[PDB]
Amino acid sequence: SGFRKMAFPSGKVEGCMVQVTCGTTTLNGLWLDDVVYCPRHVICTSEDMLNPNYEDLLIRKSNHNFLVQAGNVQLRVIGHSMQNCVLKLKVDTANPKTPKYKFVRIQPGQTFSVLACYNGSPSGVYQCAMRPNFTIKGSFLNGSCGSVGFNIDYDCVSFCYMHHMELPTGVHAGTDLEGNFYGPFVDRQTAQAAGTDTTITVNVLAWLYAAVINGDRWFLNRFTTTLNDFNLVAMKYNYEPLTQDHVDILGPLSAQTGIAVLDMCASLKELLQNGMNGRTILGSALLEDEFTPFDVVRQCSGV
Amino acid sequence: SGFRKMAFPSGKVEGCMVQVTCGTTTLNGLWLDDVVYCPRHVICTSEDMLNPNYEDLLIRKSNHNFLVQAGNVQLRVIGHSMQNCVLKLKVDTANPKTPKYKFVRIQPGQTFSVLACYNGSPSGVYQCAMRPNFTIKGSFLNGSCGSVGFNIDYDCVSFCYMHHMELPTGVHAGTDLEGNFYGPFVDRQTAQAAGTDTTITVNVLAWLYAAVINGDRWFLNRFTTTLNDFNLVAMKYNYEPLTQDHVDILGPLSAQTGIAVLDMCASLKELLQNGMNGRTILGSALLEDEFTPFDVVRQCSGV
Ligand SMILES: *[C@H](O)[C@H](C[C@@H]1CCNC1=O)NC(=O)[C@H](CC1CC1)NC(=O)OCc1ccccc1
């Protein structure tokens, strides 16, 4: 038993991280088969980044402007192209450690593992949820761009995120591996801000089920409510509306605990209106919304 | 910027995990050079585990009683011995992926990464602190024994933990890689319980410094206190006493923020006496004590 925020093992992705240098800029790239993917803003200078025309900037580059290093071994660039906000560098060697992989775009409310990297070298791994406002609450320093986010399913790595920037509130923004931003953000130094956010209701309910499975029961009650009545409380507290599909995906957890989803919704209603009164749930004094039903089932099925 | 609980990249350890089978018991082992390390209770049956004499049980085993599998490839056992609570199986192949490594025992209050594994296959990675009562708050299911905890320092893996059991309160206990338990625990099914725990004061202070570096300042005040006066408050709230050495290790964080340690201690005193009044620090509504000064410096130096 026990419930811990847990990342996927990072080894398959570690074998894909390289260092990409252009001019005086060095960031990380992802080396899959004979292609290296990295943020296109690596081709920019300090003044280029205020208002860049990336088509112009890439036309003025050649293959020899790009230094790719897989550890000590330098990789020779034999071609370059752009796909939206990602640069693709073709190299003269297929990565012998390329895993089975997909490029997938994730939905708000879904989670993924981030392998934070600097100078092509992985430094740490942690879980992130895609917020409803299309930011993530990461930990990224200078040089972290090109770090990727991913999920793993039976030795297949689904890449879903490449890191590009930090917003003024300290949250982070990036693209999928096709180079399309999550959210209404652009890769230049301007005055962008995250929109208003909301709490991921299905995830809070999943975490309450994890709590029960791990023996935290103090917040339970005898009451049940209706979907429509619960969704009125959700709007008051800036929670997403609960759909019937969300009720359906919580089915397994509802079955394992014998607590109906609308039964647990009554508990959430009381927690929202009354607070915790000094108590904790799974080691937290706040309602946690960054665990998906899948994340919970992964750790709580055996319990 | 950003501050996230972060594990070390797990790839170097993933390449060392194998599956060890004895009888109808299957758990995980750690394959380094030509030796596999695993919990000795793998040699026990259901009735053996109530009150085992491990010297007798191992004398009655032979090499062919042990099935070791590195993925699909079965490894041939050519010798076996016991070191305290760990079984060492000598195999006819040195692990080609053996990293530079050490076996180190950690101190309460220190952190490490856990690579949770089942059937020799890594499933997730997360950070744990060794509690003052020598337990950890993990996430371990049946089959997780033999999973290891580690820190990484310049491609050298320092192994510090191997998982053995779950206590009745849901926390976890295990050994160092020499097979010596952390804490007053034994590897048999009996009525063991964790002793009383305390809060790791130097870690809470380190986390408050991380908060300031990341822009959370609401808990700061103009007051300073003395070491002796603070240690009186620490005893009332079941916090460890602050030593001068702890003040010294917080030096860099104190310098980076311009807030003296005894200045920050006044803030902690107020938080302990008054609570948070509905506010949060680094996304938590509780005082967090599982980040070391090193953990904080790793993420906050660049900020
Ligand atoms: C790429 O490595 C870098 C990552 C930032 C650096 C600090 N934390 C991060 O996540 N990205 C940038 O520097 C981008 C580049 C523009 C998108 C084209 N700019 C940026 O993030 O500016 C905000 C910022 C905040 C704090 C410190 C530096 C920069």
Ligand SMILES: *[C@H](O)[C@H](C[C@@H]1CCNC1=O)NC(=O)[C@H](CC1CC1)NC(=O)OCc1ccccc1
């Ligand atoms: C080894 O894989 C297993 C790990 C436990 C299983 C559930 N969570 C864990 O951490 N260890 C054991 O089963 C040990 C064996 C005895 C030490 C010799 N026993 C044990 O943990 O018993 C407590 C327990 C609690 C919940 C479920 C099963 C067992």
